[PDB]
Design a protein around this ligand. Structure first.
Ligand SMILES: O=c1ccn([C@@H]2O[C@H](COP(=O)(O)O[C@H]3[C@@H](O)[C@H](n4ccc(=O)[nH]c4=O)O[C@@H]3CO)[C@@H](O)[C@H]2O)c(=O)[nH]1
Ligand SMILES: O=c1ccn([C@@H]2O[C@H](COP(=O)(O)NP(=O)(O)OP(=O)(O)O)[C@@H](O)[C@H]2O)c(=O)[nH]1
Ligand SMILES: [Mg+2]
Ligand SMILES: [Zn+2]
Length: 379
C-alpha cells in the first residue's frame, strides 16, 4: 500500500496540532476530586471484603495509577492476602468465586460477574455511586510493576502524557482499544507510544530498564521475570546523557507517530519492545504468526498482539493510515468552518470510513470474546 505525500505545514497549523494533543489530556483526565474518589472506593472495598476475609489487601493499578487515566476508565484492583507472598498456595479460581459471593452482599455494587476463563481471571462489577466499572484480579504482581514503570515514564516529560492521552482518544474513537472485543488493550497502545518516543531521533525518553549504576543490570525477580527499572527520575539527567535534547512539539510528535507506524516501522521484521533500545526481531522471538507484535516489558513471553485476527489488523492499520491523512493534510475551510477541532480530527466516519470494527471472534449476544453462547451473561 502506497501513501499520499504530505503537504508542507504552516506554523499556524502546527500550533493547532499541539493544542489538540493537549486538549486530549485536559478534557479527559480526571479531576483531583475524581482521583481521590477512586482511592476511596479501593478503601471501601478493602474494608467490606475484610469482613469475610481479614488480611485482604487491595491495590490499585492500571491507568488509575500509571498517569494515563480517563475520567471514565475502569478501576483496576489487585487483591492479595497479608503474609502470603505469592499465589502458589492460593486456589485462585475458587478464590474468585468466593470473592464474587462476598461482593454480591454489597448494596453499592451491581452486576457481579466472575470471569474465570480469561488469561487473567477477574471479578468485575459496577459501582453505583461513581458509575465506574471495577475489575479485581488476584496476585497480579507484574501488573503492579508495569504500572510503576509507565508512571515513571509519564513523569519524565509532559509530552509523554499528552501523546498517550491523544493515542487513547484516537484508538477509542476508532473502536480498536478493547481486547475483550478482539482489538488491542489500551495498555498495548501505551507501549506503542513509549516505544516510538524511545526510538525517536533524538529520543524523548530513555529505556529505564537499561539505566542503572554499573556495571550489570540488577536482578529483581517476580514470578520468574526481572522487574528492575530506573525510577529515580529526579536524578535522570545524571544517568541519561541525551536528557532534554529532543525539542519537538507535541503535535509534531503525534504526526510523527502516525507516520512512524505507517511509513517507517517494519511490523513483519521487528517487535515493539520498550525494555531495550536495540531493535528486537520477530525472528529472534519466533513471533512471525502476527503482523502487530508487542512484547510486554516484563513478561517476555506475552505478545500483546497475539489475539488480533487478520481482519482486525487491516482495520487497525487503515485507521492509522486515515489518521495520518487527517492530521497531516490541512483541508480547505479549516479551522474557521468547524466550531470544534476535536470533532474534526477524531471523526469516526473519516478515520474508519463509516465501517464498524470487525467482531467475528465475538459472541453474537454481548459482543465479547472467550465464551460460548450457553455461557453468555446477557443470555
Ligand atoms: O494482562 C492482563 C489482562 C487483563 N487484566 C485485567 O482484566 C481486565 C479485563 O481485561 P480485558 O483485556 O479488557 O478483557 C479480557 C478478558 O476480560 C475478556 N474476556 C475473556 C473471556 C470472557 O468470557 N469474557 C471477556 O470479556 O477478554 C480478555 C481476555 O484477555 C482488565 O481491566 C485488567 O484489570 C490484567 O490485569 N492483566
Ligand atoms: O495485556 C495486558 C493488559 C493489561 N495489563 C495490566 O492491567 C492494567 C489495566 O488494564 P486496562 O484494560 O484497564 N488498560 P489501562 O491501562 O487501565 O487504561 P484504561 O483504558 O484507561 O483503563 C494495565 O494497565 C496493565 O498494568 C497487562 O499487564 N497486560
Ligand atoms: Mg483500566
Ligand atoms: Zn456473550
Amino acid at each position: 500500500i502506497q501513501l499520499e505525500p504530505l503537504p508542507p505545514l504552516t506554523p499556524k497549523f502546527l500550533n493547532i496540532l499541539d493544542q489538540v494533543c493537549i486538549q486530549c489530556y485536559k478534557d479527559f483526565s480526571p479531576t483531583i476530586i475524581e482521583d481521590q474518589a477512586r482511592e476511596h472506593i479501593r478503601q471501601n472495598l478493602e474494608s467490606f471484603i475484610r469482613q469475610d476475609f481479614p488480611g485482604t489487601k487491595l491495590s490499585l493499578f492500571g491507568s488509575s495509577k500509571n498517569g494515563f487515566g480517563f475520567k471514565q476508565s475502569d478501576l483496576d484492583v489487585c487483591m492479595t492476602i497479608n503474609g502470603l507472598e505469592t499465589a502458589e498456595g492460593l486456589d485462585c479460581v475458587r478464590t474468585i468465586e468466593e470473592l464474587a459471593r462476598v461482593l454480591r452482599k454489597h448494596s453499592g455494587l451491581r452486576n457481579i460477574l466472575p470471569i474465570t476463563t480469561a488469561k487473567v481471571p477477574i471479578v468485575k462489577f459496577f459501582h453505583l455511586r461513581s458509575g465506574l466499572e471495577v475489575d479485581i484480579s488476584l496476585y497480579n504482581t507484574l501488573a503492579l510493576h508495569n504500572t510503576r514503570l509507565l508512571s515513571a515514564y509519564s513523569a519524565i516529560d509532559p509530552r509523554v502524557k499528552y501523546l498517550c492521552y491523544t493515542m487513547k482518544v484516537f484508538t477509542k474513537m476508532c473502536d480498536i482499544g478493547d481486547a475483550s472485543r478482539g482489538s488491542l488493550s489500551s495498555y498495548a497502545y501505551t507501549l506503542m507510544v513509549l516505544y516510538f518516543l524511545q526510538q525517536r531521533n533524538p529520543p524523548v525518553i530513555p529505556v529505564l530498564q537499561e539505566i542503572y549504576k554499573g556495571e550489570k543490570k540488577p536482578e529483581i525477580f517476580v514470578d520468574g521475570w526481572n522487574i528492575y527499572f530506573f525510577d529515580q527520575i529526579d536524578e535522570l539527567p545524571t544517568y541519561w546523557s541525551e536528557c532534554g535534547k529532543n525539542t519537538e512539539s507535541v503535535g509534531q510528535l503525534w504526526l510523527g507517530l502516525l507516520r512512524f507506524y505507517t511509513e517507517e516501522f517494519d511490523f513483519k521484521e521487528h517487535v515493539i519492545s520498550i525494555r531495550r533500545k536495540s531493535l528486537l526481531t520477530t525472528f529472534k522471538k519466533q513471533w512471525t504468526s502476527k503482523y502487530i507484535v508487542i512484547e510486554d516489558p516484563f513478561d517476555l513471553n506475552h505478545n500483546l498482539g497475539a489475539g488480533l485476527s487478520r481482519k482486525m489488523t487491516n482495520f487497525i492499520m487503515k485507521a492509522f493510515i486515515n489518521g495520518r491523512r487527517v492530521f497531516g493534510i490541512p483541508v480547505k475551510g479549516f479551522p474557521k468552518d468547524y466550531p470544534s477541532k476535536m470533532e474534526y480530527f477524531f471523526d469516526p466516519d473519516v478515520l474508519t470510513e463509516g465501517e464498524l470494527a470487525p467482531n467475528d471472534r465475538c459472541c453474537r449476544i454481548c459482543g465479547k470474546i472467550g465464551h460460548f453462547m450457553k455461557d453468555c451473561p446477557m443470555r
